[PDB]
Amino acid sequence: WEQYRDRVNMLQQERIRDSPLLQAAKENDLRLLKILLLNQDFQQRGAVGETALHVAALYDNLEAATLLMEAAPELAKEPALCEPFVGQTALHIAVMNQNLNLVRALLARGASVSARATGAAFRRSPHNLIYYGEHPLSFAACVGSEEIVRLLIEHGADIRAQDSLGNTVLHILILQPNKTFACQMYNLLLSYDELQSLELVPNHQGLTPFKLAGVEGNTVMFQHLMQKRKHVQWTCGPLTSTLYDLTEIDSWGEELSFLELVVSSKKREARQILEQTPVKELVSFKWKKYGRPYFCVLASLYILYMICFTTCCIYRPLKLRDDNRTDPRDITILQQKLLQEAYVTHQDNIRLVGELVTVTGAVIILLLEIPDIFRVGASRYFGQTILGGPFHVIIITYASLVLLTMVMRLTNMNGEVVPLSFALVLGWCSVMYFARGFQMLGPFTIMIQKMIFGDLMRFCWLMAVVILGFASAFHITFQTEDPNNLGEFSDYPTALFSTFELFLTIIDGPANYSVDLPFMYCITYAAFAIIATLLMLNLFIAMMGDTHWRVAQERDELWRAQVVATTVMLERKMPRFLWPRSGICGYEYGLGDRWFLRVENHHD
Amino acid sequence: WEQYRDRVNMLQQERIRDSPLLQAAKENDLRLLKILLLNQDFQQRGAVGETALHVAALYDNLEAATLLMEAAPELAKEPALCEPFVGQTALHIAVMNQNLNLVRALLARGASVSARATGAAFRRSPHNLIYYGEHPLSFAACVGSEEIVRLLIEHGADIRAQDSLGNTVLHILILQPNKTFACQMYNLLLSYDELQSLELVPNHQGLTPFKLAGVEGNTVMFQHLMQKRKHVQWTCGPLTSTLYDLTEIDSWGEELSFLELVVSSKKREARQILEQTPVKELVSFKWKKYGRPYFCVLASLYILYMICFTTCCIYRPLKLRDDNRTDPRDITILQQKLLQEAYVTHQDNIRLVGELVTVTGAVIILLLEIPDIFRVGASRYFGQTILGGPFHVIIITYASLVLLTMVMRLTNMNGEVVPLSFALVLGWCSVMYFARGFQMLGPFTIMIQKMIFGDLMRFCWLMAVVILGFASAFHITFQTEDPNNLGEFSDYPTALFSTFELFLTIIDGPANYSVDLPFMYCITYAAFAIIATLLMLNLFIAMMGDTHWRVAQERDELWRAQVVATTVMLERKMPRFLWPRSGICGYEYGLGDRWFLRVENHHD
Ligand SMILES: CCCCCCCC(=O)OC[C@H](COP(=O)(O)O[C@@H]1[C@H](O)[C@H](O)[C@@H](OP(=O)(O)O)[C@H](OP(=O)(O)O)[C@H]1O)OC(=O)CCCCCCC
Ligand SMILES: CCCCCCCC(=O)OC[C@H](COP(=O)(O)O[C@@H]1[C@H](O)[C@H](O)[C@@H](OP(=O)(O)O)[C@H](OP(=O)(O)O)[C@H]1O)OC(=O)CCCCCCC
Ligand SMILES: CC(C)[C@@H](C)/C=C/[C@@H](C)[C@H]1CC[C@H]2C3=CC=C4C[C@@H](O)CC[C@]4(C)[C@H]3CC[C@]12C
Ligand SMILES: CC(C)[C@@H](C)/C=C/[C@@H](C)[C@H]1CC[C@H]2C3=CC=C4C[C@@H](O)CC[C@]4(C)[C@H]3CC[C@]12C
Ligand SMILES: CC(C)[C@@H](C)/C=C/[C@@H](C)[C@H]1CC[C@H]2C3=CC=C4C[C@@H](O)CC[C@]4(C)[C@H]3CC[C@]12C
Ligand SMILES: CC(C)[C@@H](C)/C=C/[C@@H](C)[C@H]1CC[C@H]2C3=CC=C4C[C@@H](O)CC[C@]4(C)[C@H]3CC[C@]12C
C-alpha cells in the first residue's frame, strides 16, 4: 500500500527534522552532535522506531556514526520497533550503503550479525523494488561487495540462515537482476561453505537453488551451476565430450520434476532454460525416442475414437414425426426414437457397441483429466497455454457432454441434438491438441489461442457494440414492413444474427428489387458497409496478422516448450515400464549412483 | 546410433580408469608411469582396443608419451582393434590435437604414415560432427597446421590416397566449414603435388574437386579454383579483360555436366555458385542466345497443342439420352455417342484429326518424360522444386489420362468426363511450367509451389479437423429437418462439401427466413463464422503472405536457378545442331583445345 508507505516516510522525515540529534546525525553536523552528546536522550526513536545510529548510517555519515557510537554503544544492537521496518539494525543499512568502514566499526562495537529484518519493506512483493532478504549476509551478497561478505562470515554470520519465505542466501542471490557478479558471489559463498550442502536446502515452497534458478528464468546462474556438474571426458581437436549430470535435472522418483517446474512457471524467461546445453539434449532424447511415438499412438487412438463417435452421431436413431405439421413455418419431419423403439436391428446393435466404446472413452478421459486438477491446482492446470489448459477444459466438457447425452438417452429425454452438437464440435476441435507433437503444426495452435484469448476478446466488445446498434436500426427500419419480402430483420434475435452474418460478409446484403425497400435501410446499410464491413473488420484482420507475426518470430521456442510439456506429461501419466530412465546408467561403469548424459560438442 | 557411442565412450573411460597405466598416461602422472615402466603389460588395450600411447596422445601429454615410447616403441605402430575406431593409430590423435612435437616424435619412432582410420566415427555421416578423412595427411590438411603437413609429406605421406568414399585430400579439404585457411592449405597441397594431376582424380560418386566444390556450395574454394584458370588479357585503366576456362565448367561431351550437378543438389548454398564470375556469364549467354527463343517456341507449341486439346474437349460427341428421366432430381439430358455413331460428319473428321494430334502429342510427352526418370533417378527427378518435379508429375499424369481417354473412347466406355476434366485441369496448369523463362513470371510458380507443398500441407490437417467437426454438427442438426427448405446439410458428403465451401466464404450461409430453422444451427454457425471463417482462414492468409515475402526476398536467385536448370535441360534434350558449344573456339587463335570465355569487368 503506497499511501501508507508515503505516510510512514513523511512521518520519519518529520521526526528526523524535529529532534536536534537526528537532524545533526542526518546533516553530519559535528558541532551540534558533540554539544548534544557532551551533556543532556541517547535512546530516542523516530516514527519508525529507528535510533540515531540508524539515521547516521542511512545518510552514509561515518564520522557522526562514530561519534554516536563513542557514547552508549548499545545503539549498535538496537533494532527498529515499527511495522514497515521490523528488526532493521544499523548493520543492514550500513551494508546496503556499501560503507566498509561503518560495517567494520559496527562489528567492532558488537552488532548482531544474525538480526532478522522481518519488516514489510524487506519481504518479496511487487510493492518492494528490491528483495535483498533479511539477514545481513544476504544483503552483503546481493549488493555485491566481497569484502563485506568476508567480514560478516569471519565475524560469525550463518550462511544456512533462512528468511520468512525460507530462502537461503543462494536463493536471494539467484533472484537478483545483476546476474553477472552474482555468479562470482555464488562461487565465493560456495567456497566459504564447507549435514547436507547448501545447494540441497529448499525453501518453504520446496525449491532447491537449482530448481529456483530453473523457475525464475536465470540462465546465467543456470550455466554457472551446470559448469560445476559437467565432467569433460576428452577434448580431441575440435571435439569435446562432456558428461553432464542429470541428478538435479531429470529428478527421477520425485513428485515435481525440474522440467515441470520450468515449463509451468509464470515467468516468461524460463523457456530460455529449455534451450540450454544439457536440458535441450535431454528433452530431445526423451522426445525423439519415447515421446513422439507414444504421442502419435495416442493421437491415432483418439482420432479413431472420434471417428467412432462421429459415426454413432450420424446414425442416430430417428423416426417419423407423429404430430402433423400444423404451422407452415415448421420443418421438423423427424423426431428421436424412444429407448424401447431403438436398439432392435443388427445395425442398431453395432451402434450400441460403438456407443459403449464412446462412453467408456469418455469415462477414461474423465479419469485421466480429473485428478490432475486436484494434484497441480485448478489455477495452473487450466491457466497455462503451453500445458494445454483450454484443451483440458474442452476435453472435460466433451466427456461431460457425452455423459449428459447418455443420461438423456437412457431417460428418453428429447433434445439430444444440442449436447451431441456441442460434443461433436468440442471433441473434434480437441484433435488439434495433438498438433503440438509436430514442428510443422506446433505453433499454429498457439497462434489460434493467442488470436482467440487475445485479439478476439479485445475486439469483440467493439464488434458487439456495432452489431447491437446496427441490428436495432435494421429492426426498427423493417418493423413497419412485410416480413415475407425481406425477413432478414423481422425479429430482434434474427436481426442480431443477420447483422452478425453481414459483419463477416458470409451472407449477401438483403435486397429485393421487385419491391420498394425503405431508404433508411439503404443509408444505414451503406454506413454498415463502410464502418463495419470495410473498416473495423480489416482492422481485426491486421491485428490477427500482427499476432501471427509475433508468434512466428518465436515459433521454435514455443514449439520446444510444448515438446517439453508433452514429454513431462507423458512421463508422468504413462507407466514406468514404457518410460525407462533417460541417460547413461553410471553404476555399471564404475561411477556412483548418478545418471549421466554425454554431450559431444564441436568447439573452435 | 548415439546409445552405442555413449556406451563405447563410457566403457573406454572405465577401462582407462581401471588400469593403472592408462590412468597414469591420462593424468600425466610421471611417477606412477616410471614405476610401472621400470618393471612389471606394455600391450594392454582398453574397451576400444587403444593402447597406452593412444591414451597419452588423446590428453596431449607429451612427456608421458615420450616415456611410453622409450620402452616398447612398437606402440607407435599399434592400431585400435574395435568397431567405432578401426585403425586409429597414435599419429591421427597426435595430428588432431595439433601437437607438432608429438607428431615429430611418432615419426621418429617409425609410425605408419599411410595407416587408414576406417572406423565408423571417421566416416562422413550426420552422426559424426567432423569428416576429416582417414589418412593422417587428410587430418593435417583439415586441422590447419602447415608444419604437420610438411612433416608428413617429407616423411612419405601419399597425397593421392583415397578413403572409403574415394575422397582425396582435396575433397576433404573442400568439405570443411573453415573455408578461409582451407584455400591456403589447398594451394600448399597443390604446390606439393608435382599421370594425371590431383585436380582430375574423382571419388566413388564420380565428382572432381571442381565438381565437388560446385555441389557443396563452397563459393570461396570455387573462387580459389577459378583464380588458377583465368588469364588476364589486358588491364587498361578501369577495364580488365579476363579469359576464363570452360573446360571444367561447361563439361561438353559428358554424361553429367557441372551445372546439372550444381543445380540438382540437396545443398541450399550451391545456387550461390550460379552467381559467380564465369558461371553467371556462361548461363546468361546460353540463355539469352539459345535457351530463351527455344523455350518460347516450345511454350507457343505447347499452348497451341493445349488449345487443340481444349477444342477437342468442348466439341465432344454427345447425343440425346434414350432413357427417360424417371427421378425428379436427375438432370442428365445428354449422353456420350458410341464409336459407330460418332465420326460421321466433316466436323467430326476435323475433331478426329485434332484428337490424333492430341494423342500423338501425349505420346511425344511420354517419350520425352519417361527416360529421364530412369536416367537421373525417380527421387531426384520428381523431388527438386527448381528442376520442375511437380510439373513433370503433372505432365506425365496428363499424358496418361489422355491415353486412358483414348482407351475408353475406343472401347465405348461411359464416363470420359472424369479423365477429360482431370486432363484438362492438369494440362492447362502445366502451362505454368513455361513461366520460369521470364523474370516477371519466374518466382511466382515457386511462390505457389511453396504455398501448396508448404503452408497448405501444414494447415490442411487443422482445416479438415474443423470441417469434419462442423460438418458433423451441421448434419446432425439438420437430420430432423426437411431437406427441401434447406438442403445444404442433408447428406454427410454434401454437408462436408457445404462446410468446405463455407470455410472459404465462396457460398452464402444457409438461411431460409420463411421457415423456423433450429437454434443450434444458429449458435453452431456463429461459432463457425468466428473460429473458422474469421480466425483460422486469415491465419492461412497471413501464412501465405509470409511465404510470398520469403520468396520475394530471394526472387532473383531462384529465377537464376530456374534459368540454369532450364538451360541445362534444353542443352541435354535438344539436338546438338541447334546448340553449338558455347565459348570462344581457342584452337583457331593459337591456343590449345580448351574453349574459353572472355569477361570484361570494370574494376576500380
Ligand atoms: C473454452 C476455453 C477456456 C479457457 C480458459 C482459460 C484460458 C487460459 O488458459 O488462458 C487464459 C488467458 C491466458 O493468457 P493469454 O492466453 O492471453 O496468454 C498469456 C498471457 O496472458 C499473455 O496474453 C501472453 O502474452 P501477450 O499478452 O499475448 O503478449 C502470454 O505469453 P508469454 O509471454 O507467456 O509467452 C501468455 O502466457 O487469460 C485471459 O486473457 C483470459 C481469457 C479468457 C476468455 C475466455 C473465457 C471463457
Ligand atoms: C502433384 C504434385 C506431386 C509432387 C510430388 C513431389 C513434390 C516435390 O517435388 O517436392 C515435395 C516437397 C519438397 O520440399 P518443399 O517443396 O517443401 O521445398 C524444399 C524443402 O522441403 C523446403 O520446404 C524448402 O525450404 P522451406 O522449408 O520452405 O524454408 C526448400 O527450399 P530451399 O532451401 O531448397 O531453397 C525446398 O528445397 O516435399 C514435401 O514436403 C512433400 C509434400 C508432398 C505433398 C503432396 C503429395 C502428393
Ligand atoms: C459448439 C458451438 C456451439 C460452440 C460453443 C463451439 C466452440 C468451439 C468451436 C470453440 C470454443 C473455444 C475454442 C478454442 C479454445 C481454445 C483453443 C486452444 C488453442 O490453443 C487452439 C484453439 C482452441 C482449441 C479453440 C478451438 C475451437 C473452440 C473449442
Ligand atoms: C465478436 C462478436 C460480434 C460476437 C461474439 C457476437 C455475438 C452475437 C452478436 C451473436 C453470437 C451468436 C448469436 C446468436 C445465437 C443464437 C441465436 C438463436 C436464434 O434463434 C436467433 C439468433 C440468435 C439469438 C443469435 C443472436 C446474436 C448472437 C448472440
Ligand atoms: C482435376 C482436379 C480434380 C484436381 C485434382 C486438380 C488439381 C490441380 C488443379 C492441382 C494439383 C496440384 C497442383 C500443382 C502442383 C504443383 C505445382 C508446381 C508449382 O511450382 C506451381 C503450381 C503447380 C503447377 C500446381 C498447379 C495446380 C495443381 C496441378
Ligand atoms: C484444406 C482442407 C479443408 C481440404 C483439403 C479438405 C478437403 C475435403 C473437406 C473436401 C475436398 C473435396 C470434397 C468432396 C469431394 C467430392 C465430393 C462428392 C460429392 O458428391 C459430395 C461431396 C464430396 C464427398 C466432397 C467431400 C469433402 C471433400 C473431400
Topology, element by element:
The structure is cut from a larger assembly and holds 2 copies of chain A (604 residues).
Chain A: H1 2-18, H2 20-26, H3 30-38, H4 52-58, H5 62-70, E1 81-82, E2 85-86, H6 90-96, H7 100-109, H8 136-143, H9 146-154, H10 169-174, H11 181-192, H12 209-215, H13 219-226, E3 232-236, E4 239-245, H14 258-263, H15 277-314, E5 318-320, E6 334-336, H16 346-376, H17 378-381, H18 389-410, H19 417-429, H20 442-477, H21 492-503, H22 519-553, H23 555-573, E7 596-602
Antiparallel strand pairs in A: 1-2, 3-4, 4-7, 5-6
The complex binds the ligand CCCCCCCC(=O)OC[C@H](COP(=O)(O)O[C@@H]1[C@H](O)[C@H](O)[C@@H](OP(=O)(O)O)[C@H](OP(=O)(O)O)[C@H]1O)OC(=O)CCCCCCC (2 copies) and ergosterol (4 copies).
One ergosterol binds at residues 460, 463-464, 467, 493-494, 496-497, 500 of chain B.
Q: What percentage of the residues of chain A does DSSP assign to strands (E)?
A: under 5%
**What helical percentage do the residues of chain A reach?**
40-55%
- The strand count of chain A comes to 7
CATH superfamily of one domain in chain A: Ankyrin repeat-containing domain
Q: Which fold name corresponds to the CATH topology of one domain in chain A? A: Serine Threonine Protein Phosphatase 5, Tetratricopeptide repeat
Main beta sheet of chain A:
3 strands, antiparallel
Counting H and I runs of at least 4 residues, what is the number of helices of chain A?
23
Quaternary class: part of a larger assembly
Distance between the termini of chain A: 54 Å
What is bound: which ligands? the ligand CCCCCCCC(=O)OC[C@H](COP(=O)(O)O[C@@H]1[C@H](O)[C@H](O)[C@@H](OP(=O)(O)O)[C@H](OP(=O)(O)O)[C@H]1O)OC(=O)CCCCCCC, ergosterol
Main location (chains A, B): membrane
Catalytic activity (chains A, B): Ca(2+)(in) = Ca(2+)(out)
Organism (chains A, B): Oryctolagus cuniculus (Rabbit)
GO biological process, one term (chains A, B): protein homotetramerization
